[PDB]
Every structure is written in C-alpha cells, then in structure tokens.
Amino acid sequence: TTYKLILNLKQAKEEAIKELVDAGTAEKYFKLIANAKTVEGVWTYKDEIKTFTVTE
C-alpha cells in the first residue's frame, strides 16, 4: 500500500512517499518522523488514497 505525506506548518508544506505492506507500520513510521519534523496545528488524514497530513 502506498502512503503519502503532506505537512503544512513552515513557509512551505512537506512531502514524502512511502509504500508499506499495510497501513499500520506505514501509519506509525510516518507519524513518528512527521511528529518529529514539524507538528503543532491540526492533524488531517485522507482516507481516499491513504495520506497523512499535518497542517498548522
């Protein structure tokens, strides 16, 4: 399963492509790095194509 990431906080948003075997290990790994990079505003998630996003 392909998992995309789009975070919005700084002057620009972040982008990353990670396709794991399922949606858990990928949902966690993305949440880890994402939460470590930049996260403070509101958390959004698209259930249309599996994509985690953290907007300000």
Side-chain angles (χ1 to χ4, degrees):
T1 313
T2 319
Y3 251 87
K4 216 194 253 78
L5 237 173
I6 334 178
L7 315 97
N8 197 322
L9 279 109
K10 313 281 264 200
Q11 49 107 229
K13 47 264 226 203
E14 264 140 21
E15 264 105 288
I17 42 149
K18 220 69 121 267
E19 53 251 50
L20 281 292
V21 187
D22 315 61
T25 328
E27 171 233 313
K28 276 219 263 219
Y29 227 128
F30 258 10
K31 205 293 223 181
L32 175 115
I33 184 59
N35 207 97
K37 254 263 147 267
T38 173
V39 298
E40 262 122 272
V42 62
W43 272 63
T44 30
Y45 180 103
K46 219 64 219 200
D47 59 310
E48 181 179 78
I49 45 285
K50 315 280 117 261
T51 53
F52 236 134
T53 49
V54 187
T55 330
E56 214 255 68

